[PDB]
């Protein structure tokens, strides 16, 4: 992506499809990796570390390549059991919101990506949970949100601010 | 064009598209243009330690004397850590007219006691020719006969002054069996030496070797049994020659030569080893034997 941002700076479509295919192939690697390892949270952390740099493509690298999760990764991070990967997924969703809104400005990335992203959005925003259950046991909806937010829930706060 | 072409070449080679090559039988090579008969005949029955040499950067076949002086002053310098070095172009050891002309490097000691006579050649090596820039004179092959101490010092001088590097060429038993098959497939007459294949069984405590030293005519009539397509040798034909060896050795000794590995293939055309000390060049088919050797050194380079 560094060398493709300069390919926009230095004056596409066939190189575009290559980073998109790399993301889709890693998303194929990382959706069966959780099958071999039974959705191992240590592995899911690195998987979303990859997509931590996939959401922030348009805003960061100027490439119109906002590419979403495979369903098996987003839903297994939403239905995960530790808050440290849940809020990472929530932050990645917020960055996907930001990048899709930015891609709507300067302008497939327009129809199917927005459809699948709204699919992910309605699934998560309606679901927004045992990890949060554990956090609540550690403990008025706004008070609970503030307690979560003060306890390092940064990605959740960023996505809730949407 | 100049670098990305080598990238594509490497990509294709690593891709491993089907490579049983219908290589042509080595053709009787009339000694082309000006090949010094004394010099060429001097290089024939001499055991060359094979090396794969990367292209010589900023090399020129005009500045022979000053390179000879720099290397001679460095050879005797490593003795400080009686010797003459004569760079000698060969003028005819090239496959295509665009190949870099082969040049020798001889450590001559009072009289012409040639101690080392190292040799660089690029014959039918137009697969690395079209991938280097103009500043590189690509000579994939390096042929040193002298002691390994002098070879591993002139190699250092060449690395220092040309940024060219010497990986020791090792002919695997696959290429060894290949060159064994095509060198009995030649149209040669008055066979110099028996067609010997030196095997080496993979025993852990012991190091047994086998010398399947066929009569050169009997290995030709045996090859004609496995030769069906003319002009070209197939990997099926090469493997059938090797399998006729295997099933005629196991028929007697009941040990599977296919379970072993080739280490040397002596032939009336050219003897060939595995560990590097490979090229004995008995017959003057050497423009094809060296063609195989350069196309194998190109493989190690690229």
């Amino acid at each position: 992506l560094l060398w493709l941002s300069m390919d926009i700076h230095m004056k596409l479509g066939g190189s575009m499809n290559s980073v998109s295919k790399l993301i889709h192939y890693v998303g194929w690697l990382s959706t069966t990796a959780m099958r071999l390892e039974s959705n191992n949270t240590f592995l899911l952390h690195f998987i979303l570390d990859f997509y931590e740099k996939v959401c922030d493509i348009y805003i960061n690298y100027n490439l119109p390549l906002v590419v979403l999760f495979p369903p098996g990764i987003f839903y297994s991070a939403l239905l995960s059991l530790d808050t440290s990967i849940l809020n990472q997924l929530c932050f990645i969703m917020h960055r996907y919101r930001k990048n899709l809104t930015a891609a709507k400005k300067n302008e497939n990335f327009s129809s199917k990506t927005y459809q699948e992203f709204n699919h992910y959005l309605t699934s998560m925003v309606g679901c927004l949970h045992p990890s949060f259950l554990s956090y609540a046991v550690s403990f008025k909806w706004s008070w609970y949100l503030d307690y979560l937010f003060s306890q390092g829930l940064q990605g959740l706060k960023l996505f809730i601010r949407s | 064009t100049p670098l990305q072409k080598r990238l594509e070449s490497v990509r294709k080679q690593s891709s491993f598209i089907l490579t049983p090559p219908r290589r042509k039988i080595p053709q009787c090579s009339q000694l082309q243009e000006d090949v010094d008969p004394q010099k060429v005949a001097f290089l024939l029955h001499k055991q060359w330690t094979l090396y794969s040499l990367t292209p010589l950067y900023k090399f020129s076949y005009s500045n022979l004397k000053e390179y000879s002086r720099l290397l001679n002053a460095f050879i005797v310098a490593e003795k400080q850590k009686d010797i003459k070095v004569i760079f000698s172009t060969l003028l005819g050891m090239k496959g295509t007219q665009r190949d870099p002309e082969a040049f020798l490097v001889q450590i001559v000691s009072r009289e012409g006691k040639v101690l080392w006579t190292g040799w660089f050649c690029c014959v039918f090596g137009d697969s690395l020719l079209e991938t280097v820039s103009e500043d590189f004179t690509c000579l994939p092959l390096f042929l040193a006969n002298g002691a390994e101490s002098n070879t591993a010092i002139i190699g250092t001088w060449f690395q220092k002054t040309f940024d060219c590097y010497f990986s020791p060429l090792a002919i695997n038993a696959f290429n060894l069996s290949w060159m064994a098959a095509m060198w009995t497939a030649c149209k040669m007459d008055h066979y110099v030496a028996t067609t010997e294949f030196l095997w080496s069984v993979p025993c852990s405590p012991q190091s047994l070797d086998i010398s399947f030293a066929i009569h050169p005519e009997d290995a030709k009539a045996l090859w004609d049994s496995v030769h069906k397509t003319p002009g070209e040798v197939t990997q099926e034909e090469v493997d059938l020659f090797m399998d006729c060896l295997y099933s005629h050795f196991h028929r007697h000794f009941k040990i599977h030569l296919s379970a072993t590995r080739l280490v040397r293939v002596s032939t009336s055309v050219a003897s060939a080893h595995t560990d590097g000390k490979i090229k004995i060049l008995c017959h003057k088919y050497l423009i094809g034997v060296l063609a195989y050797l350069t196309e194998l050194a190109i493989f190690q380079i690229e």
Partner: protein, 195 residues
């Protein structure tokens, strides 16, 4: 013995699936370029088929594990709650190690983009400087005409070689004799001879 039993159940839920897939394949009774395209079509429609399967298994399992763990708040001291307090301590140490990673990585990306911009820009500038050196090379070819540059160049080479001899017989004649070398204003500007 129950966790091992669950491992058995998960293994035989899948070995049965293998058996049934083979049975159906044997129940069933060309374009090799597309025989892998309608084969890759399977592992994209199988993938959707047993991807939603896992996202429903995880959903219906985490729902129970939420309801099952919802009975631990009403439970007594449950030292696993003390363990989950350490889990809460572990979480903040990660998501505050991610807050930094959301700023350190952003600064690193900005620095890398700046560096790549100044790398391609430097390659452009250095290529311009090198082609300007090539433009100086035809100025060198303006010297290779050799009608009067060659003769004076050869005179320079054949007269400095006399000026690098008499000079070096001053470093060896203001040395060997009773020189009194630098205690003299005259030889002082002639000693310290410029190269």
């Amino acid at each position: 013995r129950m966790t091992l039993l669950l491992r058995l159940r998960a293994q035989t839920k899948q070995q049965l699936l293998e058996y049934k897939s083979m049975v159906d394949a044997s129940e069933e009774k060309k374009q090799i370029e597309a025989k892998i395209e309608d084969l890759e079509n399977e592992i994209e429609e199988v993938k959707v088929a047993f991807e939603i399967k896992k996202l429903a298994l995880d959903r219906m399992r985490l729902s129970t594990a939420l309801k099952k763990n919802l009975e631990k708040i009403s439970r007594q001291s449950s030292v696993l709650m003390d363990n989950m307090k350490h889990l809460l301590e572990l979480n903040k140490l990660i998501m505050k190690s991610q807050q930094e990673s959301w700023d350190l990585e952003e600064k690193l990306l900005d620095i890398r983009k700046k560096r790549l911009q100044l790398k391609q820009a430097s390659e452009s500038k250095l290529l311009e400087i090198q082609t300007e050196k090539n433009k100086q090379k035809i100025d060198l070819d303006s010297m290779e005409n050799s009608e009067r540059i060659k003769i004076i160049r050869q005179n320079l080479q054949m007269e400095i070689k006399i000026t690098t001899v008499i000079q070096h017989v001053f470093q060896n004649l203001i040395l060997g004799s009773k020189v009194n070398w630098a205690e003299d204003p005259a030889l002082k500007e002639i000693v310290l001879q410029l190269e």
